Amino acid sequence: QRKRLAEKYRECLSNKEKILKEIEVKKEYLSSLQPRLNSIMQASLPVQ
């Protein structure tokens, strides 16, 4: 039972690490899409 509780705690820690990785991926995606939208607007303004 202690080994099963340790395995459940390891699975919960892996799920928390996956949630933190998803939050970091969302933050990096927003930080990259900010300059990407800026470059897209700068490219659209020359075509406009």
Partner: peptide
Amino acid sequence: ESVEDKLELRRKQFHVLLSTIHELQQTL
């Protein structure tokens, strides 16, 4: 007059898009 209204609507849409891009550049 219809073609001029469509061109003025396209120009106002382009100006609104440029203003939104300027607001996004000012916020970021």
